[PDB]
Amino acid sequence: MYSDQTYEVIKNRTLENINLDIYKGEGSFLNNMVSGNNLELSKIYLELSKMHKMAFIQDTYNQFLDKRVNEFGVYRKLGTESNGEVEFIGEKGTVINNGTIISYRDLLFVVIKDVTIGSEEGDNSPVQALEVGKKYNLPTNCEFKLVDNISGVTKITNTRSFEGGTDIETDEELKERFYKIQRNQATSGNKAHYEEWALEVDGVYNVKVYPRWDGPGTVKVLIFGKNNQAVDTETIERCQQHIDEEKPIGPTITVVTPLPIEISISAVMKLEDGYTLDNVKESFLESINTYFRDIRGEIIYTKVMGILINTTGVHDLSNLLINGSTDNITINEDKIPSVTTVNFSE
Amino acid sequence: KESFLESINTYFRDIRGEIIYTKVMGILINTTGVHDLSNLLINGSTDNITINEDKIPSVTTVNFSE
């Protein structure tokens, strides 16, 4: 094949192809005449070998992948510039106009809106990276410096870490993305495809589909917000129109939200010295909020009393009552406990 | 039972004054593998017992059931 095809091999082949009266030998005029063209043909063979590699869908270059995805429509992502907010510290009344560029180390950043030092609007102004890339995602507490000197400005720092800086999508990543798109297509019943559209809303992070909730063909959409906290009504609505835009033909769709559950507690306890009711109350409510966040299933009475005694400032407690009972409280689905009444007596 | 024995032993090492029934309940529920407990009794009672001078608490009987 192409590896076999070389200057010497095709030289011998062409010498065999030509039968003629004059003897064939090294250094002959016809020898050199054939040898030059055979070197050219070896170069052509190398080019034809590279034809195979460049024709293949794999190991393509930027332009090759660009053409393939333009045919396919899965356009490559160019990345997003980092965005953040910085604080300007300096002489009061200093006005920094839009378009001013600030440099931290060798990085370059630009200020979007005008900021005035000491003004009632504040000294914080959003700053967007000049170029895309994760290197522009500067963390918090970075001392930005003006590229151009401006009187009245002394120190610039960011109170929040810069975000949004994304690198250019490489060839391989788009390749497996396209492969996954080709293998899997949107389908009516597969809960992954349906919940994909719901998950496109940033407010919700867990989506559940309940088949056969109101008879055949009825799909109940269950969504969970940030740590299973109900999202606003507008979020529910907009998710509803979105999923309806991508819902299949003729379903009945209902969207539900987690329902907070009130919690009322009452106990008699002996407080340790140097500790008041407010301190133990706030510590225990924080601890029980964490427990409610991390609890799966029914409420456990003994876990509640253990986290109450573990609260600092509790020596001896008694008569612990939760919602009028000391038994385990069953939590229904899509319901989260919420502390509403605390009755602590010393 | 062994984990609660170790916990109550270190609590007795760190205790001063009287044994507190509430600290006993808390150190039992905090034990790994404990989900829900009931009718906890120290010497058959839920009242704190005074640890007098030249006296230390000693664990003798452990009764746990599901």
Side-chain angles (χ1 to χ4, degrees):
Chain A
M1 61 79 71
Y2 292 95
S3 59
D4 188 19
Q5 303 286 351
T6 192
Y7 154 71
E8 178 269 332
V9 163
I10 71 187
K11 190 69 195 66
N12 192 8
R13 166 185 292 101
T14 306
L15 183 136
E16 296 148 0
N17 294 140
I18 307 156
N19 193 1
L20 72 166
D21 291 331
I22 69 185
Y23 199 83
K24 322 161 186 182
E26 175 70 17
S28 296
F29 173 76
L30 184 58
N31 190 0
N32 304 121
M33 295 299 102
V34 176
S35 73
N37 302 123
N38 295 356
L39 195 62
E40 303 163 347
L41 296 150
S42 308
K43 264 81 175 174
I44 298 161
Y45 264 123
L46 301 178
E47 293 284 353
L48 203 48
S49 306
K50 301 164 186 176
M51 295 298 102
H52 290 252
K53 300 291 109 180
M54 293 182 286
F56 273 128
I57 183 62
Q58 62 269 18
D59 62 33
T60 44
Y61 309 91
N62 46 3
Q63 59 180 358
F64 291 68
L65 177 85
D66 186 19
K67 298 171 184 178
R68 299 303 284 105
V69 304
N70 285 352
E71 300 171 1
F72 283 121
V74 189
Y75 295 93
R76 184 200 41 75
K77 305 179 183 305
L78 73 165
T80 61
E81 290 84 9
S82 181
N83 299 280
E85 183 174 83
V86 308
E87 182 185 26
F88 298 84
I89 301 171
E91 180 196 358
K92 187 185 173 178
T94 312
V95 173
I96 301 104
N97 48 303
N98 46 0
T100 51
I101 51 172
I102 52 173
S103 59
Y104 180 86
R105 289 199 308 192
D106 293 332
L107 277 299
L108 298 183
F109 288 87
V110 67
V111 174
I112 296 92
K113 65 165 281 297
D114 302 352
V115 60
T116 311
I117 303 177
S119 74
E120 293 83 6
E121 288 179 5
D123 311 334
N124 297 354
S125 179
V127 166
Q128 158 189 9
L130 277 186
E131 293 86 6
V132 301
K134 196 257 180 181
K135 69 190 292 184
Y136 287 92
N137 272 350
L138 271 182
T140 185
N141 196 358
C142 295
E143 290 82 4
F144 290 82
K145 175 67 176 177
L146 292 173
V147 188
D148 45 351
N149 276 336
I150 295 171
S151 66
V153 178
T154 67
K155 191 245 195 167
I156 309 175
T157 183
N158 64 318
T159 50
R160 296 177 188 180
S161 296
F162 273 61
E163 290 177 353
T166 56
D167 291 330
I168 304 181
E169 185 182 21
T170 74
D171 293 332
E172 315 88 10
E173 305 156 355
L174 187 65
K175 275 187 173 181
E176 75 255 10
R177 162 195 177 187
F178 173 74
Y179 282 136
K180 181 180 181 179
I181 290 173
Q182 282 285 352
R183 301 303 181 189
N184 298 330
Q185 282 71 60
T187 54
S188 173
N190 189 209
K191 292 153 297 313
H193 297 107
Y194 198 87
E195 291 154 0
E196 178 183 2
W197 311 310
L199 282 168
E200 290 163 5
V201 182
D202 50 353
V204 295
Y205 307 90
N206 181 19
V207 188
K208 171 64 174 60
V209 161
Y210 272 100
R212 206 65 186 254
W213 74 274
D214 211 29
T218 64
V219 169
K220 168 178 303 168
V221 180
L222 162 57
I223 62 182
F224 298 89
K226 178 163 287 298
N227 202 3
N228 299 0
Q229 299 181 0
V231 298
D232 58 76
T233 307
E234 188 174 1
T235 295
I236 294 176
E237 297 166 0
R238 66 181 282 175
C239 180
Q240 167 70 19
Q241 293 84 18
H242 174 78
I243 64 189
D244 287 8
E245 292 286 349
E246 289 85 4
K247 78 183 188 181
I249 298 100
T252 55
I253 300 310
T254 53
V255 174
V256 295
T257 189
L259 311 176
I261 286 303
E262 57 91 19
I263 302 296
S264 61
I265 206 165
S266 62
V268 190
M269 72 291 291
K270 306 290 109 177
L271 293 186
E272 305 271 12
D273 67 318
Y275 272 66
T276 70
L277 268 182
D278 62 270
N279 301 315
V280 56
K281 261 180 185 180
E282 66 187 2
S283 300
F284 172 64
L285 72 86
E286 178 186 4
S287 298
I288 203 66
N289 284 334
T290 309
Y291 174 71
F292 289 159
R293 283 179 291 170
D294 60 54
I295 184 176
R296 314 290 104 197
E298 323 173 358
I299 298 172
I300 298 169
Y301 177 77
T302 49
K303 288 298 186 291
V304 166
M305 61 79 71
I307 207 164
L308 184 41
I309 178 68
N310 289 140
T311 304
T312 303
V314 183
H315 178 272
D316 187 358
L317 73 164
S318 57
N319 292 318
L320 169 69
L321 202 69
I322 308 160
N323 276 349
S325 166
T326 72
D327 293 328
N328 284 340
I329 289 183
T330 303
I331 301 180
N332 290 319
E333 303 185 5
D334 310 335
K335 291 188 179 182
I336 50 178
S338 170
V339 174
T340 50
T341 304
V342 170
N343 295 319
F344 285 2
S345 58
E346 190 164 1
Chain B
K1 266 187 184 173
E2 293 154 11
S3 300
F4 177 62
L5 273 170
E6 300 298 325
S7 78
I8 199 63
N9 284 321
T10 190
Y11 172 61
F12 286 175
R13 295 305 98 208
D14 277 330
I15 205 179
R16 199 268 306 158
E18 320 195 3
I19 43 174
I20 322 174
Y21 159 77
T22 53
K23 302 231 177 203
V24 177
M25 294 183 286
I27 205 65
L28 180 50
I29 184 62
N30 295 148
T31 309
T32 303
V34 174
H35 184 277
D36 213 8
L37 61 83
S38 57
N39 57 270
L40 197 149
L41 300 158
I42 53 170
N43 271 359
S45 163
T46 65
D47 309 340
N48 300 349
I49 297 178
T50 312
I51 297 169
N52 304 328
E53 281 197 0
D54 60 270
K55 288 182 185 185
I56 61 165
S58 164
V59 174
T60 312
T61 301
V62 172
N63 161 265
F64 286 147
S65 61
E66 192 161 17

